[PDB]
Scaffold this active site. Structure first.
Site, PDB file in Angstrom:
ATOM      1  CG  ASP A  35      -1.889   1.124   1.299  1.00 26.66           C
ATOM      2  OD1 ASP A  35      -1.912   1.925   0.348  1.00 26.66           O
ATOM      3  OD2 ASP A  35      -2.441   1.543   2.274  1.00 26.66           O
ATOM      4  CB  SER A 199      -1.963  14.359 -13.309  1.00 22.63           C
ATOM      5  OG  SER A 199      -2.457  14.018 -14.627  1.00 22.63           O
TER       6      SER A 199
END
Length: 330
Positions: A35, A199
């Site tokens: 994770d 992004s």
């Protein structure tokens, strides 16, 4: 040194991935959920409340000749999905894919929430976010990667998650045969303890690319892709019959639909998520309403590039002094 381990989807939807991890001496092999959005290595154990164990493999520290109680240390964690777990702490030897760390904090669960009990395939979590998020008290502990970093050939790990197929976590090296084209690296902020990056925009299907900054985290422990409501609305508007359902808890769409791809930007590069990766199947067995793999982050407080996004790429978690993330197509 290096390590390499295969990671396997737990179910037919790729809801999560498990990777075998050797703990203790002799080895006890548990299948952990790696994770990158958390920083605790915790396991079902011989100390876990018996009614809260239902098919998981447990770590028994008393059978490990290298286990040592970390005196006074406790842990307690709550995840973004509302689940939680807590317990005490041992140090022990932990190996992943041939890479061994001695003295790793292994957080032994005394209590786990119902969602962990109900998933017999996941024996614990192995956190790979930054150690500043580790919950051990009163002395915060280091992640497996942090402990291994200095020994690795290169201070990196890579996630290569499969679509309906096994994939690979590598430590200490880049497998240049595992991706196509080049890896585009992008800056990371560690201020929140996550692999947080920006992004450069998105496209829906064959549509034009929208240049817009989207800050979010690369999180292998989250199934779906959580993005701003404007972006998610633009995506689902291209799917006939798709709608946001308050009762179901997100966007649903007719199972008969063919979904468009979703592209996200990494610098000037582009990662394309095929439409089929966004189908998470019937909301309940036999339903013709299917659950979408792209969902709004508006209620989370952060955007999350979960498995839906990451499994479309070969992803480099570069833990150099100034960390960066790399993405390549594959």
């Amino acid at each position: 040194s290096t390590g390499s381990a295969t990671t396997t989807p737990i179910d037919s939807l790729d809801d999560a991935y498990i990777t075998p991890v050797q703990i203790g001496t002799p080895a006890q092999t548990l299948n952990l959920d790696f994770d990158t959005g958390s920083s605790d290595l915790w396991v079902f154990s011989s100390e876990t409340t018996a009614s809260e164990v239902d098919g998981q493999t447990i770590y028994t520290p008393s059978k490990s000749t290298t286990a040592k109680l970390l005196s006074g240390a406790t842990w307690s964690i709550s995840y973004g999905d509302g689940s939680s777990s807590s317990g005490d702490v041992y140090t022990d030897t932990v190996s992943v894919g041939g890479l061994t760390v001695t003295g790793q904090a292994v957080e032994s669960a005394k209590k786990v929430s119902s969602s962990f009990t109900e998933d017999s395939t996941i024996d614990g979590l192995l956190g790979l976010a930054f150690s500043t998020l580790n919950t051990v008290s009163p002395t915060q502990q280091k992640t497996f990667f942090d402990n291994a970093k200095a020994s690795l050939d290169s201070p990196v790990f890579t996630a290569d998650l499969g679509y309906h197929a096994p994939g690979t976590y590598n430590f200490g090296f880049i497998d240049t045969t595992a991706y196509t084209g080049s890896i585009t690296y992008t800056a990371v902020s560690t201020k929140q303890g996550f692999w947080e990056w920006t992004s450069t925009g998105y496209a829906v299907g064959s549509g034009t690319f929208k240049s817009t900054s989207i800050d979010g985290i690369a999180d292998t422990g989250t199934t779906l892709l959580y993005l701003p409501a404007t972006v998610v609305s633009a995506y689902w508007a291209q799917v006939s019959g798709a709608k946001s359902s308050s009762s179901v808890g997100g966007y649903v769409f007719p199972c008969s639909a063919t979904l468009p791809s979703f592209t996200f930007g990494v610098g000037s590069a582009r990662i394309v998520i095929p439409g089929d990766y966004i189908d998470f199947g019937p909301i309940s067995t036999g339903s013709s309403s299917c659950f979408g793999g792209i969902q709004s982050s508006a209620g989370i407080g952060i955007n999350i590039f979960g498995d839906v996004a990451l499994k479309a790429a070969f992803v480099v978690f570069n833990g150099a002094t100034t960390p960066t993330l790399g993405f390549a197509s594959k």
